[PDB]
C-alpha cells in the first residue's frame, strides 16, 4: 500500500493535468479560428 498508493498518486494527478491541458488547447485552438474569421 505505501508503494501502490504512491504509484496511484502520480497516476491520478498526471492524467488530471493531461485532461486540463487537452481542454485548454482546444479552447485556444478554436478561439484562434474565431478571431481569424473576424480577421
Amino acid at each position: 500500500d505505501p508503494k501502490e498508493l504512491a504509484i496511484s498518486q502520480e497516476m491520478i494527478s498526471d492524467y488530471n493535468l493531461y485532461v486540463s491541458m487537452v481542454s485548454t488547447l482546444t479552447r485556444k485552438g478554436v478561439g484562434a479560428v474565431e478571431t481569424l474569421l473576424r480577421s
Binding site: T24, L25, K28, G29, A32, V33, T35, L36, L37, S39
Partner: protein, 199 residues
Amino acid sequence: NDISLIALLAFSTLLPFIIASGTCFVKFSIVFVMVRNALGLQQIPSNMTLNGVALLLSMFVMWPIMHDAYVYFEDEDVTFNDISSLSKHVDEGLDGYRDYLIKYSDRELVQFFENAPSIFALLPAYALSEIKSAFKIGFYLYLPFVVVDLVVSSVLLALGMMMMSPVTISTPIKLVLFVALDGWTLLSKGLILQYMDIA
C-alpha cells in the same frame, strides 16, 4: 521538463498572429477581396466566405511544416553535456520552417535587420514582400474589368444615352461574364500552384 510546457502552450496563444503575419494567409486574403472590389459589390461573396476558404488553403501549406516540426522534436535525445549543443538542436527543428521563409523573402531587408540567419529578421521582410507580390497580381486581374466598363459607357455615348448612370448597367455585365468564364475557380487554383504542388 515543465519548461517545455510553457513554450508548447505559448505557441497556441501566439498562433493567431503567426497566421496573421508569417504565412501565405497574407497573400491569400488580399487578392480575393481586391477582385471583389473589382466587381463593385462589397457583400458578395460575403467576406466570411473569403476568410473561410483562404484559411483552409493557407492551412494546406503550413500543415506539412507543422508535422515536420514535431516529427523531429519527438526524438527525446536532445539532452547533452554542453548548453549550446542542446541549443543547436532546437535550431535544427526550426530550419524546416525557416527554409519556407528564406525562399520567398528578398536579400535586402534580411541583412538590414541583422546588423541593426536570424529568424526575427525575416517575418517583416516576408509580409512586406507578400503585399508587394499581391498588388501586381491584383493589377493584372484589374485591367479586364477596366476595359469592359469602358466599352459599355462608350456605347451610351455612341447613342444619345449620355445622362444615365453607367454603373447600374455595367455591374451585372461585369459579374455575369466573369462567372461565365468560371474565374473564381481559376484565380484560386492559379494561386495555390505557386506555393505547393496542388492535387
